[PDB]
Motif scaffolding. Structure first.
Motif, PDB file in Angstrom:
ATOM      1  N   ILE A 114      53.646  21.978  21.530  1.00 38.90           N
ATOM      2  CA  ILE A 114      53.149  20.874  20.714  1.00 38.90           C
ATOM      3  C   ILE A 114      51.855  20.324  21.296  1.00 38.90           C
ATOM      4  N   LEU A 115      51.744  20.268  22.626  1.00 41.69           N
ATOM      5  CA  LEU A 115      50.506  19.776  23.218  1.00 41.69           C
ATOM      6  C   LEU A 115      49.334  20.706  22.913  1.00 41.69           C
ATOM      7  N   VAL A 116      49.531  22.019  23.060  1.00 42.28           N
ATOM      8  CA  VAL A 116      48.433  22.945  22.797  1.00 42.28           C
ATOM      9  C   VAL A 116      48.078  22.946  21.315  1.00 42.28           C
ATOM     10  N   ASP A 117      49.064  22.742  20.437  1.00 49.01           N
ATOM     11  CA  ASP A 117      48.766  22.608  19.015  1.00 49.01           C
ATOM     12  C   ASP A 117      47.925  21.367  18.748  1.00 49.01           C
ATOM     13  N   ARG A 118      48.261  20.255  19.411  1.00 51.30           N
ATOM     14  CA  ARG A 118      47.459  19.045  19.271  1.00 51.30           C
ATOM     15  C   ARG A 118      46.026  19.266  19.738  1.00 51.30           C
ATOM     16  N   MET A 119      45.840  19.990  20.844  1.00 47.14           N
ATOM     17  CA  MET A 119      44.484  20.291  21.296  1.00 47.14           C
ATOM     18  C   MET A 119      43.736  21.211  20.337  1.00 47.14           C
ATOM     19  N   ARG A 120      44.412  22.223  19.787  1.00 41.63           N
ATOM     20  CA  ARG A 120      43.724  23.257  19.023  1.00 41.63           C
ATOM     21  C   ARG A 120      43.568  22.926  17.544  1.00 41.63           C
ATOM     22  N   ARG A 121      44.282  21.927  17.025  1.00 41.68           N
ATOM     23  CA  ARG A 121      44.140  21.598  15.609  1.00 41.68           C
ATOM     24  C   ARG A 121      43.131  20.476  15.381  1.00 41.68           C
ATOM     25  N   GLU A 122      43.394  19.294  15.940  1.00 43.78           N
ATOM     26  CA  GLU A 122      42.510  18.156  15.714  1.00 43.78           C
ATOM     27  C   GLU A 122      41.177  18.343  16.429  1.00 43.78           C
ATOM     28  N   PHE A 123      41.223  18.720  17.707  1.00 37.13           N
ATOM     29  CA  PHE A 123      40.006  18.929  18.480  1.00 37.13           C
ATOM     30  C   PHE A 123      39.462  20.346  18.367  1.00 37.13           C
ATOM     31  N   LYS A 124      40.241  21.280  17.817  1.00 36.24           N
ATOM     32  CA  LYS A 124      39.803  22.650  17.563  1.00 36.24           C
ATOM     33  C   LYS A 124      39.466  23.373  18.865  1.00 36.24           C
ATOM     34  N   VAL A 125      39.890  22.818  19.998  1.00 37.93           N
ATOM     35  CA  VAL A 125      39.690  23.468  21.290  1.00 37.93           C
ATOM     36  C   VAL A 125      40.958  24.246  21.637  1.00 37.93           C
ATOM     37  N   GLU A 126      40.816  25.557  21.811  1.00 33.03           N
ATOM     38  CA  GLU A 126      41.932  26.440  22.118  1.00 33.03           C
ATOM     39  C   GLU A 126      41.725  27.055  23.494  1.00 33.03           C
ATOM     40  N   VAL A 127      42.727  26.909  24.359  1.00 34.10           N
ATOM     41  CA  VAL A 127      42.638  27.359  25.741  1.00 34.10           C
ATOM     42  C   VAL A 127      43.851  28.222  26.063  1.00 34.10           C
ATOM     43  N   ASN A 128      43.619  29.278  26.840  1.00 35.64           N
ATOM     44  CA  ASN A 128      44.665  30.201  27.255  1.00 35.64           C
ATOM     45  C   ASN A 128      45.313  29.717  28.547  1.00 35.64           C
ATOM     46  N   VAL A 129      46.621  29.938  28.655  1.00 39.70           N
ATOM     47  CA  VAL A 129      47.389  29.488  29.811  1.00 39.70           C
ATOM     48  C   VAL A 129      47.008  30.312  31.034  1.00 39.70           C
TER      49      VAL A 129
END
Lengths: 276, 67, 77, 80, 203
Positions: A114-129
RNA sequence: UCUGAGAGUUUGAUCCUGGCUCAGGAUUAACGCUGGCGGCAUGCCUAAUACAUGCAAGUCGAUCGAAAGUAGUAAUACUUUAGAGGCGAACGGGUGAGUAACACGUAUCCAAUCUACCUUAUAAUGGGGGAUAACUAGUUGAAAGACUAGCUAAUACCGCAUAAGAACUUUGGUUCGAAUCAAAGUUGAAAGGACCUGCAAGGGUUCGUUAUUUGAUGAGGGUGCGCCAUAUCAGCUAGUUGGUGGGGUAACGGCCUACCAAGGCAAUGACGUGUAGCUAUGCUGAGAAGUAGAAUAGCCACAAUGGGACUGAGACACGGCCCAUACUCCUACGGGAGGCAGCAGUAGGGAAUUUUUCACAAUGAGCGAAAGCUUGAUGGAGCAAUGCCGCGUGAACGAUGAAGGUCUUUAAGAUUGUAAAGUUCUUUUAUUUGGGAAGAAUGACUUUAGCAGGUAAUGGCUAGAGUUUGACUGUACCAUUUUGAAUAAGUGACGACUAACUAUGUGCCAGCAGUCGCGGUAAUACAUAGGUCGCAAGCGUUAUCCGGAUUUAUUGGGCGUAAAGCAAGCGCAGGCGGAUUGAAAAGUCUGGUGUUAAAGGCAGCUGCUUAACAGUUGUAUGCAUUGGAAAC
């Protein structure tokens, strides 16, 4: 400690956002504006005591470093974490000094999702673990002796210093110095600098910058010159000898072995023993 | 930001160099460097600091030193 | 959304119907004069022109110009 | 009005209701500061009657300012 | 800015003691050499139009206690009038409020006069002045409130105040009146303003 | 007169032609280091990119019927308007995408056009008819809506009458493509409301309306002139050029059309391409002029694009309609809302352009006899040192100069340094006490006093008294209000250019840097300490514009050796052009008139304690006309 201006109220219904004006004791809504509010804050209009809570939660803390890929996305991710921290005050993010990258904590796999979804949807920033990092403190093992020389002519005048330092590691007692110079091989004026010459250099490790801890340093012999051989020569010789000792000693690493209390009902106890 | 690419000088001792960072630019002129009459600002989102510095705190973006 | 906008729209729909009606009443008598070039037809045309000019459907300059064109033809007769 | 903030300075002008605020004006009547409690308008009262007789009535706020000067006392009788 | 730090520093460096020989007095050393770590015999060869103009301007704005921006602002204000702009400009400078207070001796220094004015203890023609930037005309009166005359310091300064024929003082009532423009001999002759006038190349 | 500054940089050394950099002002500035306030202005030039939501034009019951509800036996009183109708909506608001020419700037001519309401007074506001929403019922319908039939009033619509006055035509007359006027032919205007008085009849106050009729005003059309670069763009143009007839927008006009045609523009550079809002104005220098056309004021146009029409007096209309086009959103999938370059605000961009702000208090606007309604126009407040002015962050006394530091580094000493240790004083600010604004004196409401055709009535005009009039704001500001040096400084640089230097490190490595040029061994050129100098709640820093640079030169350069005479001759257009006599007055000089908006600059003055800022008086320049002069 400030007066917020309530601009407009609204109730998010099943499909619609009903904009309302008056709220009595029993109804709940949301406010547009107050864009710096943090969850848990209480609102006061008629000078009432604030019901701010700070002892109602537990820490699910599990550190997980998140490696960055593009620096611009990292800079925007910092703002994203700032804008998501107030969403859950019990959501934890660390900033490791050695590796200045975000350290996410959560309540398990779905929490990270859910945290990575929040980062990648609203802020459109997607980061790999990536992989977590540990402090990994440093010590080492006893060594015979170390020499240190420093001779220069720069500036129209030289600088001279000769030191012998024997570098003793420990596991419990931190930095401590003992002086043994007898016979005029160094003036007293340069005794205290060397006391500060070693410890200031002790905070550097030859593996990954982890400071060297719990070491004992001593001085036995040395050599200098006439009116030349200023103070800085021995100060830098101490650091050089410290670095050489830390390098040639084949140092050893230490990690904190955490005491784990695994509390379980009387159903998985034998399985817990097997798993451990 | 445009399709063009520019050569610049990195001021001061030390480096914040990773060959991957977006950074701002500064003017000025350095005639010793052939083809370099443009500069990178030191003390911004990238190239953040020069240590030991206690003077010239208009470039190098170094915080004012106090005890 | 402007309430006066839609109000005036529903008003001038009817106004446009009436104006088109009066304009066609004018033009059919203008055709009648083109068929019969006589004094009675000119008198009817000018009466209708004054009726439109009374409310303001046709500007006085336009009415004067058209009546000059028609009276010239009648005078040629 | 115009001028710096906290200093209301409304130059007295004859206005036709079609013109925007402090735009191209027909003719400036004079100058008046509402803050000062003293008559200070520069008026000739002759060209003012000229504009009155040629229409395009100026602001109403100055009508009272013309009753004190007796402009009405002569304007209403010059109408006849 | 408005404060120059140590007053004796400027006096020793620029060879101008505001008090005849008190700001370069034997206060532990009596020397005219500039202060600093380089006190030594040196060959003065850069002393030219650039150097002398800077010296006169700095001495002007430090004795008058006026920042550079205000100083050029007052110069531009003087430029609006006509005549011999040098002497008239100096007269306008001398008509400054704190300078008049200092010449009356009601305040030991121009900085003390600035403190007195800003704290609000000077009355000018039915108007109390709070900004230490006021130009006085002939026949302009200055009053000190009964509240602000209770201090041994101000009374001691008044009893040892500066004499000035160009203005009228009533020390028994603590009243001042700017009588007339001070004459050339009544002006400080330490600084030559013409060089500072030529320093203005912003025209 | 407004009003004028230079230095360094080529060489062994000297001069000369030229270039470069520095020395200074300004921003629609921003970055970097810091950071107190008051006054005031300013705060998307990029994506005229897409944009959720609230506002950004609403109003009229003294226009109308009716509808609903609070009282009332009902009647009727009381509150509102769903609709019709009326006014308003085209202006304010915002941008500069696009537009290279009457768009812009300016003077005329409109014998080429109009202007509701405002200003001018006059004929009148006569008598009838028909529907129609509103309302009900039925249908399509989830609603949204749409369809069908009855019900209803009007300052809504439609005949007729009167029409002085008007338009049209004819006869006569005025004048140099039109003028004024006599008679005749023809044509067409509406409505009453509200109030008062009067038994009624009727009369009166105001408004609404038609006709007629004066200005003013806005818009449109033509005009000479000047108003970007570009020849490494020589032909461009087909209703084009012109004529006859006709139609057409307010008009004249191929504006359009039927016919006849052949020219028109054009090396004094059209056409082509790039760019572009323009002007007054902002800055620079004394100026020639350049620079920028923030805001502002006017003019110009579109409102996601391409088109079209309607209402209206004016729109092809910021948030009007329809059509085509790209998208979002809803849909029950049948179809629908459409378009924040309005106030905001956000996604993104960039260096960056802001509260998802108050009230219409005041002006204005829109409307209504009115209580008055709306107003993200307008005036305040918020954020930001973006910029300007002021203002504190203490002052007096206190040493051969306390301590420590720095330096010669001696067992002289200087240095920081009246700074301090320390003693007095003092409060703009930090801080409580009290007091408290000017801004409505905008008007209206109620009473009275006088005024008038009329006075039989109240209304129309001017005065006096009371009613209220703030978003601001218990704000500003003031008063020994209380305590209190306490509550607030950093910045760049010191080899020279160009005022401001010594110590440690340093070995062409680091690094400095606007230039000359510095650093491969005592570096006043670098890094640091100290000292010093200059600015300051700001300093530097870059971008960019004027000066220096007269360094594109009428003012303000040369062409023999630093760049430069076509290789020469003939030569058009064009430029320059002998004198004497005469005229004219086009250029030219001068007298007068009107225009050249305000604001801005210049000089004088006024106020907020005072600068900044605002306001007042005078104030150029150009244009056209009138009158002089003939020296060119």
């Amino acid at each position: 400690n400030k007066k917020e201006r309530v601009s407009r109220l609204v109730k998010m219904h099943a499909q619609n956002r009903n904009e309302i004006e008056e709220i009595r004791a029993g109804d709940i809504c949301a406010i547009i504006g107050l864009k710096d509010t943090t969850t848990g804050e209480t609102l006061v209009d008629d000078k009432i005591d604030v019901q701010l809570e700070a002892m109602q939660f537990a820490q699910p803390v599990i550190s997980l470093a998140v490696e960055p890929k593009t620096k611009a996305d990292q800079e925007k991710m910092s703002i994203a974490l700032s804008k998501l921290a107030e969403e859950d005050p019990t959501f934890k993010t660390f900033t490791d000094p050695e590796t200045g990258q975000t350290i996410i904590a959560g309540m398990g796999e779905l929490h990270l999702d859910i945290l990575v979804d929040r980062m990648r949807r609203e802020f459109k920033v997607e980061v790999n673990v990536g992989a977590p990092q540990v402090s990994f403190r440093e010590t080492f093992n006893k060594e015979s002796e170390v020499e240190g020389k420093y001779i220069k002519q720069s500036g129209g005048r030289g600088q001279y210093g000769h030191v012998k330092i024997r570098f003793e590691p420990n596991k419990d007692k931190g930095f401590e110095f003992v002086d043994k110079i007898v016979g005029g091989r160094i003036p007293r004026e340069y005794i205290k600098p060397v006391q500060a010459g070693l410890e200031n250099a002790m905070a550097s490790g030859p593996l990954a910058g982890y400071p060297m801890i719990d070491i004992k340093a001593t001085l036995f012999d040395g050599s200098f010159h006439e009116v030349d051989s200023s103070e800085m020569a021995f100060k830098i010789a101490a650091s050089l000898a410290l670095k050489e000792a830390g390098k040639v000693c084949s140092p050893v690493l230490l990690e904190p072995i955490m005491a784990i209390e695994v509390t379980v009902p009387e159903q998985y106890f034998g399985d817990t023993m097997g798993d451990i | 930001t445009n399709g063009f690419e520019v050569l610049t000088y990195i001021p001061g001792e030390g480096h914040n160099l990773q060959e991957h960072s977006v950074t701002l630019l500064r003017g000025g002129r350095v005639k010793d460097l052939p083809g370099v009459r443009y500069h990178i600002v030191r003390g911004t989102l990238d190239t953040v600091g020069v240590e030991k510095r206690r003077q010239q705190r208009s470039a190098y973006g170094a915080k004012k030193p106090k005890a | 959304n402007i309430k006066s906008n839609e109000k005036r729209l529903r008003q001038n729909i009817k106004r446009n119907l009436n104006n088109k009606g009066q304009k066609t009443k004018l033009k059919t008598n203008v055709k009648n004069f083109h068929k019969e070039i006589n004094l009675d037809n000119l008198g009817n045309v000018y009466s209708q022109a004054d009726r439109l000019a009374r409310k303001g459907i046709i500007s006085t300059n336009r009415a004067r110009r058209l009546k000059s064109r028609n009276v010239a033809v009648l005078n040629k007769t | 009005r115009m001028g710096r903030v906290h200093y209301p300075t409304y130059r007295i002008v004859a206005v036709d209701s079609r013109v925007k605020r402090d735009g191209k004006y027909i003719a400036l009547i004079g100058h008046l500061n509402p803050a000062l409690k003293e008559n200070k308008c520069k008026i000739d009262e002759a060209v003012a009657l000229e504009w009155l007789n040629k229409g395009a009535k100026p602001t109403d706020t100055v009508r009272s300012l013309f009753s004190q000067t007796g402009l009405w006392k002569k304007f209403v009788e010059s109408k006849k | 800015m408005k404060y120059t730090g140590s007053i004796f520093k400027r006096s020793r460096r620029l060879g101008f003691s505001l008090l005849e020989n008190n700001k370069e007095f034997s206060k532990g050393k009596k020397r005219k050499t500039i202060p600093g770590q380089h006190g030594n015999r040196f060959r003065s060869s850069t002393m030219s139009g650039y150097a002398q103009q800077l010296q006169e301007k700095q001495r002007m704005q430090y004795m008058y206690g006026i920042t550079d921006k205000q100083f050029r602002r007052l110069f531009r204000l003087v430029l609006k009038q006509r005549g011999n702009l040098a002497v008239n400009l100096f007269r306008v400078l001398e008509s400054r409020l704190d300078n008049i207070v200092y010449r009356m001796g009601f305040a030991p220094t121009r900085r003390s006069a600035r403190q007195l004015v800003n704290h609000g203890h000077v009355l000018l023609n039915d108007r109390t002045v709070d900004t230490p930037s006021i130009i006085l005309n002939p026949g302009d009166k200055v009053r000190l409130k009964a509240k602000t005359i209770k201090i041994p310091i101000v009374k001691a300064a008044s009893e040892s105040g500066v004499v000035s024929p160009f203005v009228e003082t009533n020390n028994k009532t603590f009243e001042g009146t700017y009588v007339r423009f001070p004459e050339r001999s009544e002006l400080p002759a330490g600084i030559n303003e013409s060089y500072v006038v030529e320093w203005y190349k912003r025209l």
